[PDB]
């Protein structure tokens with residue numbers, strides 16, 4: 001599985017039949033159809049105690065991993081019940097500014113999308129949580145090209161150190177708070193992992209407000225490689241999945 005012509009998303013169903021299931025992700029968010037749900041509580045993002053450990057190129061993206069052994073960086077409230085702990089964050093991006101996001105808003109595509117992955121602490125570990133319908137909560141953040149995002153520069157400067165698949169680098173004292181938009185207004189819907197095994201265990205929380213990054217910052221993303229060191233160079237670009245059928249599900253809005 002990958003994002004090329006021969007292993008791309010249109011092929012994923014052969015090894016992961018769930019790819020054509022009922023609650024697949026990402027999806028187009030139709031703002032005129034989304035239902036404002038007054039019963040929706042404000043998101044509760046507590047990341048002041050976050051502990052980042054490292055960053056790695058897994059051959060389809062780069063992940064910034066976090067120590068999830070204690071309630072240090074947690075998400076609650078919103079449509080959620082209980083506590084979800086931050087385990088990692090990664091991005092999806094394009095070859096040009098016109099594409100790259102997973103979710104789309106009224107069919108508009110962003111230059112990239114940020115996913116903050118969190119797992120429900122009642123299930124005791126990540127691997128158990130993926131087996132549950134309310135097992136994960138993912139915070140989606142859209143990225144538009146404009147002004148630089150100061151809080152993202154620390155991520156950009158280390159990309160050189162992890163150019164190819166399998167490389168990783170110590171990455172401590174990174175504060176996720178520098179990646180959040182001013183508003184916490186969101187859309188939510190039941191869905192799935194955006195990559196294989198594509199398990200339908202996620203409560204998606206997509207924020208309405210995009211963060212802007214500079215052309216120079218996204219450029220640095222486009223320099224990563226899908227290949228391992230010593231293999232022909234395959235730039236890491238367009239690592240995003242096309243929108244899937246909503247099939248009955250309803251998208252609620254907090255605003």
Ligand SMILES: [Zn+2]
Pocket residue numbers: 090091092115194195
């Ligand atoms: Zn993702």
